[PDB]
């Protein structure tokens, strides 16, 4: 029946379905609402999920994880070459593509990243089918906002290989926002910050939501930071405590270290709801029982640099988004590590007491939003686009920002690009791109009769006026003579579709850097030439 949402996560994945007016996150065959994204190959079998993760220490070279770090990349990508150094499994280059290479039933086999991820998705699919008692075909799968076209397409292929029809690939932060219904809040646009701290990765995203349209303003984070690091601080703390008390270093013994790590992970979880946790390990090393405890404050101190460090990407995202912290309407906590009270406090204090949206299980929120969107996709007055004119060099100079309420009037003053320019061409464009080449021309007209003056002297006042019915009147006035000309541009056609708008916004995002570079290339901001830049011959 219904399509499922799937958070295909770096360490674990989660699947959910919107039914009977409610999202249900679906437990797997061991009763777990999240499934490790792990695939293991053995002499006899292929394990996926919990079974895979549980045996990793017995079969590490054959147990694959972190495929999401490879997916859609090229073997010689610096990220891949750096990541490979920390993985026990082999990654090899097949005609430029990374493949993970393993031993399976006594033979060497290799898989593309999207094949591995497809195996994880097959597991989630089957989990969903067990729960629903029917075949699951359609799905929405989520990816990090920073994923490029290659990574998105490879994630989609992973879905296709698994027998899923992927209705849409959507951004994790967007999923999170949908989960909290921040898109249904419609009113003036809202700036949302998604703070996603998982086991292995930390992503910060700033979105602006206007009229149901999500725009990613900025992304930042740390691809190497998560709960495991916090666990690791406690582990090392306790190794040192043991060495200090018993004069033995247990690091030599792998299993002892494993047992310690497990205990610290549990303790860390306890410290989110209690101010202390007890560690009890029988015969940790050399027959010595380790029974001790740790306070929340001590855990916080052990982590202080890591925790306080999470604010740095928040700050950078705010800068890149050209927003003051006070301009953030909604803060969303995603990822298990946001359960940590110090993290929540650090963040709330940074935001001056502002309340965080935490109520949805932070491990499940992305899947939740995905499930909602899947449901919608299986079924379940303001300006649509920025409006501006061409200025010298073909650059788009915006008079009215997308999603401005109408009626509206906006005026800006422009000048001439060259000496003794007799006229200016007023070329009215609509779109989110920096260069008019990439936007849509709605109309054009000339203001002639400009008295000869040095470049930059004449003052031409341009006015964009939109009435309640959305009819756009654009006029230019020579401020020295009062002479004027204008054009009327007819819009309400039902000519743009919500999808068109999302598309344009997303492309404007994809191209942001190139656009900026080309934007600030031209010296003066308000200069108008006498010709259409995009009709001018180039090589």
Swiss-Prot record:
GO biological process: chaperone cofactor-dependent protein refolding; clathrin coat disassembly; mRNA processing; negative regulation of DNA-templated transcription; protein refolding; protein targeting to lysosome involved in chaperone-mediated autophagy; RNA splicing; synaptic vesicle uncoating
Residues given in the record as ADP binding sites: 11-12, 199, 265, 268, 272, 336
Topology of this chain in the membrane: Peripheral membrane protein
UniProt-annotated stretches for the region Substrate-binding domain (SBD): 381-495
Subcellular location: Cytoplasm; Melanosome; Nucleus, Nucleolus; Cell membrane
Predominant place of localization: cytoplasm
Binding positions (ATP): 9-12, 68, 199-201, 265-272, 336-339
GO cellular component: cytoplasm; cytosol; lysosomal membrane; melanosome; nucleolus; nucleus; plasma membrane; presynapse
Function: Molecular chaperone implicated in a wide variety of cellular processes, including protection of the proteome from stress, folding and transport of newly synthesized polypeptides, chaperone-mediated autophagy, activation of proteolysis of misfolded proteins, formation and dissociation of protein complexes, and antigen presentation. Plays a pivotal role in the protein quality control system, ensuring the correct folding of proteins, the re-folding of misfolded proteins and controlling the targeting of proteins for subsequent degradation.
Family: Belongs to the heat shock protein 70 family.
Name by which UniProt lists this protein: Heat shock cognate 71 kDa protein
Full protein segment contained here: 4 to 553 of 650
């Amino acid at each position: 029946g219904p399509a499922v949402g799937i958070d295909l996560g770096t360490t674990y994945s989660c699947v959910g379905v919107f039914q009977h007016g409610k999202v249900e996150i679906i437990a797997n065959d061991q009763g777990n609402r999240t499934t490790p994204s792990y695939v293991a190959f053995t002499d006899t079998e292929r394990l996926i999920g919990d079974a895979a993760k549980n045996q990793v220490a017995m079969n590490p070279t054959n147990t694959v994880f972190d495929a999401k770090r490879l997916i859609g990349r090229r073997f010689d990508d610096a990220v891949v070459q750096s990541d490979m150094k920390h993985w026990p499994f082999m990654v090899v280059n097949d005609a430029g593509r990374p493949k993970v290479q393993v031993e399976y039933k006594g033979e060497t086999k290799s898989f593309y990243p999207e094949e591995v991820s497809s195996m994880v998705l097959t597991k989630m699919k089957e989990i969903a089918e067990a729960y629903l008692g029917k075949t699951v075909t359609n799905a929405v799968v989520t990816v990090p906002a920073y994923f490029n076209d290659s990574q998105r397409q490879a994630t989609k292929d992973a879905g296709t290989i698994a027998g899923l029809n992927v209705l849409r690939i959507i951004n994790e932060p967007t999923a999170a926002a949908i989960a909290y219904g921040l898109d249904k809040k419609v009113g003036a646009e809202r700036n949302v910050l998604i703070f996603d701290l998982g086991g292995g990765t930390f992503d910060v995203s700033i979105l602006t939501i206007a009229a149901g349209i999500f725009e990613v303003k900025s992304t930042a984070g740390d691809t190497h930071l998560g709960g495991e690091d916090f666990d690791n601080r406690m582990v090392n703390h306790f190794i040192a405590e043991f060495k200090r008390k018993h004069k033995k270093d247990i690091s030599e013994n792998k299993r002892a270290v494993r047992r310690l790590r497990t205990a610290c992970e549990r303790a860390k979880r306890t410290l989110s709801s209690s101010t202390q946790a007890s560690i009890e390990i029988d015969s940790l090393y050399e027959g010595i029982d380790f029974y001790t405890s740790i306070t929340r404050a001590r855990f916080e101190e052990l982590n202080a640099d890591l925790f306080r460090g999470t604010l740095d990407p928040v700050e950078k995202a705010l800068r890149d988004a050209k927003l003051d912290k006070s301009q953030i309407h909604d803060i969303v906590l995603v990822g298990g590590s946001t359960r940590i009270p110090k993290i929540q406090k650090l963040l709330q204090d940074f935001f001056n007491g502002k309340e965080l949206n935490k109520s949805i299980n932070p491990d499940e929120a992305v899947a939740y939003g995905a499930a909602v969107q899947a449901a919608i996709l299986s079924g379940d007055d303001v300006t649509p686009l920025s409006l501006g004119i061409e200025t010298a060099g073909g650059v788009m100079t915006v008079l009215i920002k997308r999603n401005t309420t109408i009626p509206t009037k906006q005026t800006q003053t422009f000048t001439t690009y060259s000496d003794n320019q007799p006229g200016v061409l007023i070329q009215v464009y609509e779109g989110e791109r920096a260069m008019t080449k990439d936007n849509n021309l709605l109309g054009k007209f000339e203001l002639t009769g400009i008295p000869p003056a040095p470049r930059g002297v004449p003052q031409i006042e341009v006015t964009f006026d939109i009435d309640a019915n959305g009819i756009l009147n654009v006029s230019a006035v020579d401020k020295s003579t009062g002479k004027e000309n204008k054009i009327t541009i007819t819009n309400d056609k039902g000519r743009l579709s919500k999808e068109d708008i999302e598309r344009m916004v997303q492309e404007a995002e994809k191209y942001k850097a190139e656009d900026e570079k080309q934007r600030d290339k031209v010296s003066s901001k308000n200069s108008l030439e006498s010709y259409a830049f995009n009709m001018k011959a180039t090589v």
